[PDB]
Amino acid sequence: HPTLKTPESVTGTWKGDVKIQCIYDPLRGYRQVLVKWLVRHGSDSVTIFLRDSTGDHIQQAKYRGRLKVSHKVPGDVSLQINTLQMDDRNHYTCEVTWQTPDGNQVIRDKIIELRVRKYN
């Protein structure tokens, strides 16, 4: 399966915008079937974004209208956050599910720490 490639951490500016990269090289046989982004919520995680066969779903009021996950370049499922909040400092998980020719599904994920600085 494709390696999910992410930086270890990303730093953005308070009230600015930032991208958290999550990219894999497409690989013959492996069809992407689900993408999720999750954020830590105390001692577990919660979904903040899902892309599936019916498109993108961002259903929390705190996120709807300010998250964009890349969609035009195969393998690029990077998350961009509009107007960073100090409380956006957190660990974010990029999670991708692929299907193989035999119908097997492989799921991989990666945790990226997001830091938020008050000024540039």
């Epitope: 660990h91 799921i107 994920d109 720490e113």
Partner: nanobody, 125 residues
């Protein structure tokens, strides 16, 4: 660059129990899923057990299911492997590893970034 150091290895009799630990350096321990792997003489390195960043999900190789339990203390930057009902075939060098997987892939060595030097465990009979 996180450094990992295993402790607690040694000689134990078959049927006995042994507790390994692994200390991680730094202030970002909770950024990592942690795992134990082992490598016996002549054999390739294989998965033993893993534990999610939160200490709340664990994963085991079929070879050690039930007998071995992995745990972590994020306040101490430490992961533990409690090995019960030991068998001579559990003899190996045991390696601690850290990676940025969350819930998935923990049985695969390529999902880990950093490795300890390993500690010898010998189970005699």
């Amino acid at each position: 660059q996180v450094q990992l150091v295993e402790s607690g290895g040694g000689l134990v009799q078959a049927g006995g129990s042994l507790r390994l630990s692994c200390a991680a350096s730094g202030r970002t321990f909770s950024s990592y899923g942690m795992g134990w792997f082992r490598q016996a003489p002549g054999k390739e390195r294989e998965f033993v057990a893993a534990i999610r960043w939160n200490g709340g999900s664990t994963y085991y190789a079929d070879s050690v299911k039930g007998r071995f339990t992995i745990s972590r203390d994020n306040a101490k930057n430490t992961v533990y492997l409690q090995m019960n009902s030991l068998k001579p075939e559990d003899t190996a060098v045991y390696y601690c590893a850290a990676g940025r997987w969350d819930k998935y892939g923990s049985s695969f060595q390529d999902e880990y970034d950093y490795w300890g030097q390993g500690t010898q465990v010998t189970v005699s009979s």
